[PDB]
Amino acid sequence: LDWTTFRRVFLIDDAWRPLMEPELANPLTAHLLAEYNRRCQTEEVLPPREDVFSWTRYCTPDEVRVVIIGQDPYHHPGQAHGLAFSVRANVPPPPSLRNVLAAVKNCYPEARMSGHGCLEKWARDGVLLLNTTLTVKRGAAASHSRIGWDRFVGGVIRRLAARRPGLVFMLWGTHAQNAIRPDPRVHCVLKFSHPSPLSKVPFGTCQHFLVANRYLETRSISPIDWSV
Numbered sequence: 001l002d003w004t005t006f007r008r009v010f011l012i013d014d015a016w017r018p019l020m021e022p023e024l025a026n027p028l029t030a031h032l033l034a035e036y037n038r039r040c041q042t043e044e045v046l047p048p049r050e051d052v053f054s055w056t057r058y059c060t061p062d063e064v065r066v067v068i069i070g071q072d073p074y075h076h077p078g079q080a081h082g083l084a085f086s087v088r089a090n091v092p093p094p095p096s097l098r099n100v101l102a103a104v105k106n107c108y109p110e111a112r113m114s115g116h117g118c119l120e121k122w123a124r125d126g127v128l129l130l131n132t133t134l135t136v137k138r139g140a141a142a143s144h145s146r147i148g149w150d151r152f153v154g155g156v157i158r159r160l161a162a163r164r165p166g167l168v169f170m171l172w173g174t175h176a177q178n179a180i181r182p183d184p185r186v187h188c189v190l191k192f193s194h195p196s197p198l199s200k201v202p203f204g205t206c207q208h209f210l211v212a213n214r215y216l217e218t219r220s221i222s223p224i225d226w227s228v
């Protein structure tokens with residue numbers, strides 16, 4: 001009972017079994033899991049274990065329309081909850097997220113913006129918010145970036161993409177563009193500089209949300225209501 005036990009520890013939705021189960025058997029995965037559990041014995045690891053795989057709960061692989069890649073979770077208590085960039089409902093949006101929400105409103109002036117930074121609505125809509133590193137030590141950015149999450153997540157993404165042609169990938173920044181390299185003839189690959197205001201080009205000028213919806217329409221795929 002490997003999948004059964006793994007799924008129970010992380011409360012993973014069963015719909016993701018075909019994409020994740022094959023990764024469990026890889027010997028490299030065992031090293032990853034043991035290291036993650038070792039870190040939890042020696043430090044404050046975020047987000048909480050029950051939230052690490054929260055991204056599997058909002059939508060099934062077949063509902064995925066857009067994939068947005070991130071680096072690692074927010075590292076202060078209360079911010080991260082398993083979705084890249086999203087913060088729980090009453091936490092003020094951090095700098096990069098603030099720029100993302102700005103670009104959405106610039107693209108869709110009619111979008112019903114709530115003012116919060118919780119992206120669960122997007123997730124249920126098939127917008128997969130995926131960090132390549134799923135955990136972080138409290139207060140230390142990129143601290144868990146070399147423990148092996150990237151190859152596991154990388155394996156799930158390859159499987160998903162091969163399962164469903166015509167996905168839209170939004171790759172913002174140097175890390176995202178080097179981590180994930182989907183076939184641009186089979187999928188819509190959109191690249192931009194990082195959303196942080198420290199980037200040389202203001203992220204508020206990014207048109208990705210509009211361009212993604214035009215691509216979906218050409219494939220007869222229902223476009224996304226980016227209001228959040």
Ligand SMILES: O=c1cc[nH]c(=O)[nH]1
Nearest residue numbers: 070071072073084085
């Ligand atoms: O989840 C998060 C938060 C900030 N930056 C990222 O790359 N991912």
